[PDB]
Amino acid sequence: PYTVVYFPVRGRCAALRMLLADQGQSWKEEVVTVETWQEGSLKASCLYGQLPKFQDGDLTLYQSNTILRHLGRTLGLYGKDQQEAALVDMVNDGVEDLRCKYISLIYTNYEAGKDDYVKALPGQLKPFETLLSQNQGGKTFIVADQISFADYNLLDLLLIHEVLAPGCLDAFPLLSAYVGRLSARPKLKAFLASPEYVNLPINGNGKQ
Amino acid sequence: PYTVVYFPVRGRCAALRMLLADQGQSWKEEVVTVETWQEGSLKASCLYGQLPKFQDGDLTLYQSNTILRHLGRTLGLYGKDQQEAALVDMVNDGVEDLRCKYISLIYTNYEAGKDDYVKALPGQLKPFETLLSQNQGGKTFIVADQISFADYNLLDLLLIHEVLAPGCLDAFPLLSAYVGRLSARPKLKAFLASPEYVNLPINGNGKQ
Ligand SMILES: N[C@@H](CCC(=O)N[C@@H](CS)C(=O)NCC(=O)O)C(=O)O
């Protein structure tokens, strides 16, 4: 029923894959090689000339966050009412903002910019620790008491930053425990340990 | 019932203001001067240390797109069903991507980067013309047959780009007619002509 069209990297598809695996959904991975991409035709047929491309039956979507929100609506991972839905969006938009900065560092100036990025990290992660502290003492999810699509995206964001800066979560007990807890969910834990996750690089230029 | 807390610029609050005005809603503008911002306390109290900040009763939201989606959900400007809601999100995410590039040009290297930006513009605007052509001949809205929050955001994006590059819509008949049509809606037209819109600069560094 679902198809993910993407480069052979975790990148912007890692969160939605975790979501699908954790929700026990099945999907197909349509892999696009850089060589195939450079050919040009697939790219020209993409709405914004980029991937991921996602298919849910005959519904074709582009934009990683559009895919996350769509799955969030159809699978019931978007809060229980309008107010929670807004808080879920606020978290996801925050995650996207830091993901954009991470992507800029990785692909644009890893070598010269990493020191400053890492130095500024605590201030960028703190908002999520604060969100958790204001929600049942941080013992459940990022918004309210049920998992949402924002949790999967925030989880990915935290996992890749621990690779970029080992121990960056040591100063945030709530986020630390949160990562441990979500990573232990049976289906997610199995997915995270599997070759289809582990054998894909985080990014496409070999930096992490 | 609504309060918008922002710098005295259109920027990231222009689309949501257009939406509120067009929908006949009333709101309070709480203006924050750069001097007040530099003081530090308001900023430290902002979730992600940034504005806009929005209040809907006792619900406090941050993130311009979260505010747009919230208003979209509560005012019924998010498509008629889940499938349309996903298409609305796809359009908005695309608008955000080009808005990010516009903001980077404006604040980061207007002088040296404008020629290349303007040269790449047609290819960045074409996806929206294509979306319109695939939706009832581009005669109604960007998604389906009812206005959505994505329309207000795409409209702002188009208006600021015509200021940055006059005639950039000449090659796009559907987008051209779309801008004329939406700008003619009574309440929106009055808002667009009013001093509270007209006398605010588009950005905060005087470039446009
Ligand atoms: N806003 C888009 C960004 C998509 C994006 O940056 N795609 C990259 C790979 S992660 C791409 O397709 N690069 C190839 C190109 O632009 O030609 C999303 O979140 O899906």
Ligand SMILES: N[C@@H](CCC(=O)N[C@@H](CS)C(=O)NCC(=O)O)C(=O)O
């Ligand atoms: N992702 C945020 C971006 C917010 C943003 O860039 N805010 C700027 C002005 S538009 C700001 O608050 N600048 C002051 C600062 O960062 O100290 C949104 O879309 O609301």
